[PDB]
Design a protein around this ligand. Structure first.
Ligand SMILES: Cc1cc2nc3c(=O)[nH]c(=O)nc-3n(C[C@H](O)[C@H](O)[C@H](O)COP(=O)(O)OP(=O)(O)OC[C@H]3O[C@@H](n4cnc5c(N)ncnc54)[C@H](O)[C@@H]3O)c2cc1C
Ligand SMILES: Nc1ncnc2c1ncn2[C@@H]1O[C@H](COP(=O)(O)O)[C@@H](O)[C@H]1O
Lengths: 388, 228, 184, 387, 386, 387
């Protein structure tokens, strides 16, 4: 290779100024409103689409940019500095896309990727159920083959954009035999959202990220045609499992984005607030906080960068992604609470921007794999280096 | 009218119960205990009547270890005037039951010259629902069990009680025994002021030997297990 | 060893919980006597007779047994106990059942046993305790077993194929320390 | 003469009442009160009826004259229910404390007596838009006009600030900026209907939403001379001497919130399975429940200690500040953890844990931040080793 | 009743004796004892003279008959001085626990009594090269043979093993490998002069360098049936039971060492200057010091509580385990922080704090590691729910 | 350009040299050296033969003229073996650096050349009994008396201090108390043999026990003005200046240590069993090894990043301190845990983790404390936001 390098391609500086411009001029002024009401932020999403900073993984031959993972993270962080409600609605897109990208054929890729190119359509990742989240192999949604079709019966839970999606990627149980290993019991589908059997549930009310819609949805007798399975039967589990490589690093990039905001807000504030004669930053305790916060963001940034480079390069990045996701998530929380703190009573208030960050940050420890789960994956990956 | 109210110190219902390895009974050491919730209801009834000024005094009796001080004290805080603890060491506590207790409570009743014994309908520990009946039995007085409504009528009680289909309604002559059921009333709180005022009110600690009662039980628990 | 069953009833209608009681009764392996008390008894006495397990139906008819009051019925059951000497006196662990037996017991000066779900033998029983969260097994060594019986823990006995004698019960003096006034 | 860790029987009954009310009347409606931010009036009135409020008011004033140890145990039980409501009712002790420690018979009968008679609220008025932790940087001027005093300036973040009969209010008595803090402030009792008081709109905060918190402007407020706490300039001693008997109560609230986190996380981890087993059978989750239990346990002894020190008439500045620091921190720690254990659900608005994360954050800010608690413990600590 | 946090007037005498012994007699030599690592025989004898040792022994046997709360006051004071020394002292009382809680009067008078007449030592031998934490994993077999038992196996890491008059020994009775802990072990009293007992070399450890820790091998060692503890197969319950009364005392050691570290570090930051100020006037230093004072107080209340729990007749398993875990960890955090406050001096053996870092690590390993401690708390805790 | 976390083929080979070296030559004697405290001359000397030492010395003096990234990457491999020996090795770079950045063709050819021909050692000399962190408070005197300066005072904790051919020395040259650091100090090269230099005893330290640490007294010591750095009074800039290209190599050292800890703990957790499962099947253990790997991975990038900023001619201070602070903490954290995973064995001299714990502590302390690394990070960060 050449040296190590921590310098963006001019093209990437180019993408960065755009996402940062939008995030700073369009998202920021409105984000407190959308968090207050939960209104799904349609004008910004359209604008993000328009501005080219959405559906970025779609390959060129379906009429997208075919951007890389590093580029997607680069952008994510900027939108997430503005708002992660918004950034999460944008991402949900990639997440439903990813299995169509990695595992679909040309007719699928083109019909279903292609359409997001020509309208700001939304799509969704449909996996989690009331009874299984972390334990993917625990999902219970049924798929029975009946002719040239599949019938789907199941409930889904916590689905981002679940109520705004033109279509879903769906994981289901293909084979009834309980004893059937995960590498053979699931099938992956594209399901158009307006198919007869499908009932979106209500907008689900959460602590954080209150402007993306996440919803449960039920499939009663849903009809899904052969041409929409992903590799074939029993392939469902590898197919879902393989999307995370290209996407975990982006959600981590999200966490880093809210983390940076918190630091920024907290730093501006400590620069202007006085107590006992001096500005907050002249009290060592505060200084030191601002310092550790500065460290954590930096390290969390290199971490997700690292993960996106490994995959961009064409290796499997499971280990690096999972450090990124664990570490980014953990520090995002830590920094959110500390930002509230540095702001004192003001931080706990609704008119200042920090409590929101505190509420938004918790999800990074939960979805797209929890902290524990991140840690399982890493230990697994670590321990193999030590066997023959 | 003078009233006697029976109160039983039971494993607080909230405590989730654990069964002994030696499978002889359940685990009663270092285990929170309050006043059985039906007794709560009866103590409430003594007091509402004392409030309606139809009762001049309310005695509260309890049978077991010394920790039944705790139990009698709560009753005292709710409106009970003096307390009686009948003392049985936590050894003989084990093999004591509704028979013993009714025997106890009856001797007690005739002695303190009472006109009503109020009990809760069943203890959440042994689930017997036997004491009240048995006590009415020894005094030869009538019994309104599972009372859901009560009313003094001179020298007659009118008891509405809770029977399998709906309510039944009795008139009883007046030394009477009444056992409280859930729908009877909503029992009041011990107010912090009255919990303080209750320290002042005294509890005579006596023994079953004194009252004139034998504790020997030809019953016998053989084993206790978990459920299926 | 003989057994006695207080039949619960109403408006000429054996209460179901009694059939279950009678199954539980025959488990003990002794002539099963069943006692019907009330103000119009003869009809139920007749159904009780048809029932399998039942060697003798005793009838105590009398106006005073309005509302089956435990102060009226207890000396009645006691009167029957003297003429006959049962080892066992049971009833369906219903509101009627639970109200009557512990008194009867007091009067006999034996300790009763509540709400049983199995019968390990003529002196060993199984109830629940603490909202049923444990299972208690009790050996009773009394001159008389008094106890009530959980309905759903035993099958209803065949209502036909019974060859029971129906006899006049022994009589008791109306107490009138309680009185029935009303229902729903 | 021996350590003891067993309550008096009197205190167990107190706890049983406080726990009955909290489990049966607070919990079933705490989420409503959190959704709507409406002030829990029906509940305060109940707790007041129960004898659970103004526990500190001495006997000869119609109150219970109860110790700091008792308030702590009551208030843990109430926090477990809702710290929104535990905080509304605690703020009455906070406003009353200056009067209880430092007020003349006329004052204690006048202003504490009312609280015995109707269920009215009072509030502690000290913070301002521009000083909070730096009490000494309080700038609300108070000036003499023989007869009386004239209050000018502005208070922020006042618990019960719009539902109060009266205020303990602390103001700069002395214009000289070279004046020492211990003689610069006068503390007043200040009737809330007094002309010139402008109470503000409710403050919309992240947590303990049903608590009333609001800002107040004072303009040319006339306060009578007989309402001064000890004398001119004495305020700072007074204001400060209060935290002795309040800080352990606040800590006891953080621990309330904490048990509740602990309890909800444990219940859930006992029903939810992942990968074929209950949450409790994955070591990482056990170890979590473990570390939560320990932090709860020690937070509790720390406030119990602080409360006992002051009940022995010793001052407890070291101890209180240990408890407030530790309780604050672990309450925050336990909150996210309860939210983490309940996974997706935890983060949702219909499960009970998410509120606890939002409420817990206040414990590192009001009644002295995590930072200034640490300055106090350092001050007190160093002094033991110097000459 | 009521809660109380004041020692008893008598307790305060123990504390005074113990502080005087530790400060006037342990501190001045401890540095050296760490350097040379030799067994501190004289300070032990003196601890023994002064009443600060074998404290759990009943009046019956000529002991002082004191509680776990009393034992805890003393160990905190001794540990402040040196945990090496204080370990060697407690080891005796851990040795004794299984005999105190489960001996009959012959054994108690015999093996406890002697400790009254003479400053002898005993040890607890349960650990093995194969199993420590996992007690049901010990593979030392004991076979019956008429009126006496033949012990074959090997024990490792024995405090005072090697300086002892006798040992508590746990061994696998039942040879069928399917048998439960509850019936597979017998606990013995084993006299040390016994033939077959080969005491190994002095083990060379990071910290508590003057404690005698070593492995011992057992070749055909014969143990009379009179020295079995409750009966064949009751070994587990016996050992397990010892822990309630001792774990709080290891916690108090952790608090002793901690306290020392805070003392050292505080003393120093009141006299070193950097950038024109005493260390103490830098807010980062103060905040450390605060946090340290914070942990010692919490840590001490945790053992105190545990100790009172058992002393008042109930099981304290949950609280004891909390105390151990929390004190053990904060021991290690305080020590590294003390070194940190003292700068390069701190890293240097001519100052008292680097020794603390090496001593404190043990407090997260013996008598149940941090992890085993959490297991216990979780199990205790969860069990109040279903 | 764009990001790359890939080494040059040349780098991949330097790394392989030093791995081979540290793994076959260092590891199998380190424990032995640590037990005795003997300075490991065979090793220093073998390092020099392999070109793994004095790496920053330019080509124009016969040096390798390598970058900070290269020194870092070498240093991690050596520290994995032993940080006692690598700190003796690195010692040489800390002393050389102020000559590398600020002296003139004459000074470099004389004092760097020599190192290029014999394995000599040199040292950095700044700290004194009264100051280490506060460099502006050093009291060693340096006055001009002719075409030369006289030196009086005392140095403490000098790595290589008793094994050094020459010293880079820093003395206060300006008597005026009120004189700023920017002007008040001069930096000197100083040959070890000079009259008046008395080397003290080998200092006995908790860890890195075979590194040579000593105190040095300067009694009326004369150095030629030819040996002055850029000029009189520009000393502080010279010393401060060095910290850019040395600080990352110290942080790689810790990462090396950290990595060793991880491997020893992982290798063990894979062969010890308890309660029937391998250590590694106890989730609490998996999770420890998982957080450990994370810390190592992140700390590695931390130093790599600061190494690259400078290698590319940017200033460094911020990234370097982040790395130093962070890699420092994690070494310590990783060492207790590695001791912890081995259990009772971990505590014992016959296993290799005990040492690592003792060794790991200097990383919080030398080449700038954990505390002052935070001061530096803070000030660099707060500047990005100030007008
Ligand atoms: C707002 C948000 C958005 C979401 N969006 C989507 C989406 O669009 N698509 C989708 O498919 N899902 C989505 N989810 C589901 C989310 O992925 C899951 O909630 C999470 O991944 C696993 O959650 P759970 O609630 O089932 O956790 P649980 O499986 O109930 O676990 C709860 C706790 O146990 C821990 N735990 C579980 N198993 C173990 C173990 N083996 N060892 C140690 N610890 C363990 C967890 O880490 C967690 O702390 C979303 C969730 C949130 C609420
Ligand atoms: N040990 C006791 N002491 C006092 N009263 C008792 C006792 N046991 C039962 N009672 C009274 O009898 C009622 C129920 O007894 P039981 O039939 O066992 O459920 C209770 O509600 C009490 O009022």
């Amino acid at each position: 290779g050449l040296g190590f390098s921590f310098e963006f391609t001019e093209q990437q500086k180019e993408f960065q100024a755009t996402a940062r411009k939008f995030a700073r001029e369009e998202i920021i002024p409105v984000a407190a409103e959308y968090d207050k009401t939960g209104e799904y932020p349609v004008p910004l999403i359209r604008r993000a689409w328009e501005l080219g900073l959405m559906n970025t993984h779609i390959p060129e031959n379906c009429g997208g940019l075919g951007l890389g993972t590093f580029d997607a993270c680069l952008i994510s962080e900027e939108l997430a500095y503005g708002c992660t409600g918004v950034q999460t609605a944008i991402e949900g897109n990639s997440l439903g896309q990813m299995p169509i990208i990695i595992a679909g054929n040309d007719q699928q890729k083109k019909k279903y990727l292609g359409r997001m190119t020509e309208e700001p359509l939304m799509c969704a990742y449909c996996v989690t159920e009331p009874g299984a989240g972390s334990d993917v192999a625990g999902i219970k949604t049924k798929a029975e083959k009946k002719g040239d079709e599949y019938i789907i019966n199941g409930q889904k839970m916590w689905i981002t954009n679940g109520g705004k999606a033109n279509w879903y990627f769906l994981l289901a149980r293909s084979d009834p035999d309980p004893k059937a290993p995960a590498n053979k019991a699931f099938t992956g589908f594209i399901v158009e959202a307006d198919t007869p059997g499908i009932q979106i549930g209500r907008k689900e009310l959460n602590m954080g990220q209150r402007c993306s819609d996440t919803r449960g949805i039920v499939f009663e007798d849903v009809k899904v045609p052969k041409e929409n399975v992903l590799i074939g039967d029993g392939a469902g589990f590898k197919v879902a499992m393989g999307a995370f490589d290209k996407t975990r690093p982006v959600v981590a990039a999200g966490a880093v984005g809210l983390a940076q905001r918190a630091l920024d807000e907290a730093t501006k504030y400590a620069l202007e607030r006085k107590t006992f004669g001096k500005l907050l930053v002249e009290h060592q305790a505060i200084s030191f906080m601002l310092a550790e916060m500065a460290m954590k963001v930096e390290l969390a940034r290199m971490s997700y960068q690292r993960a996106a480079w490994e995959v961009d390069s064409g290796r499997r990045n499971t280990y690096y992604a999972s450090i990124a996701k664990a570490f980014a998530g953990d520090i995002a929380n830590q920094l959110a609470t500390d930002a509230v703190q540095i702001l004192g009573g003001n931080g706990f208030n609704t008119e200042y921007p920090v409590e929101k960050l505190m509420r938004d940050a918790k999800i990074y420890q939960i979805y797209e794999g929890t902290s524990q789960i991140q840690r399982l994956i890493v230990a697994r990956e670590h321990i193999d280096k030590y066997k023959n | 009218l003078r009233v006697l109210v029976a109160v039983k110190r039971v494993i607080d219902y909230a405590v989730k119960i654990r069964v002994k390895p030696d499978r002889t009974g359940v685990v009663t050491d270092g285990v929170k205990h309050s006043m059985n919730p039906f007794c709560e209801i009866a103590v409430e009834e003594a007091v509402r009547l004392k409030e309606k000024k139809l009762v001049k005094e309310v005695i509260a009796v309890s049978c077991g270890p010394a920790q039944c001080q705790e139990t009698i004290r709560t009753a005292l805080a709710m409106g009970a005037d003096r307390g009686i603890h009948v003392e049985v060491p936590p050894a003989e506590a084990e093999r004591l039951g509704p028979l013993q207790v009714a025997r106890v409570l009856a001797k007690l009743a005739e002695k303190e010259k009472v006109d009503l014994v109020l009990l809760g309908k069943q203890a959440i520990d042994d689930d017997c629902n036997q004491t009240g009946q048995m006590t009415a039995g020894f005094l030869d007085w009538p019994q309104g069990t599972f009372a859901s409504q009560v009313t003094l009528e001179g020298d007659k009680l009118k008891v509405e009680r809770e029977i399998d289909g709906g309510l039944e309604t009795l008139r009883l002559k007046l030394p009477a025994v009444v056992t409280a059921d859930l729908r009877l009333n909503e029992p009041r709180y011990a107010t912090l002021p009255n919990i303080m005022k209750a320290k002042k009110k005294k509890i005579e600690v006596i023994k079953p030997g004194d009252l004139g009662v034998d504790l020997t039980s030809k019953l016998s628990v053989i084993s206790v297990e978990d459920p299926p | 060893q003989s057994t006695l069953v207080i039949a619960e009833h109403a408006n000429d209608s054996l209460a179901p919980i009694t059939l279950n009681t009678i199954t539980a009764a025959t488990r003990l392996g002794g002539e099963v006597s069943c006692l019907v008390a009330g103000t119009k008894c003869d009809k139920v006495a007749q159904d009780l007779c048809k029932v399998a397990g039942i060697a003798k139906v005793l009838v105590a008819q009398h106006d005073v047994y309005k509302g089956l009051l435990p102060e009226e019925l207890t000396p009645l059951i006691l009167a029957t106990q003297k003429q006959f000497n049962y080892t066992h006196i049971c009833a369906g662990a219903s509101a009627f059942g639970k109200n009557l037996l512990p008194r009867v017991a007091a009067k006999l000066e034996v300790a009763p046993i509540s709400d049983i779900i199995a019968i390990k033998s003529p002196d060993t029983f199984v109830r629940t305790i603490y909202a049923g969260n444990a299972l208690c097994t009790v050996k009773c060594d009394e001159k008389v077993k008094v106890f009530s019986v959980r309905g759903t823990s035993f099958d209803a006995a065949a209502t036909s194929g019974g060859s029971a004698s129906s006899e006049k019960a022994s009589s008791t003096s109306p107490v009138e320390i309680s009185e029935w006034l009303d229902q729903k």
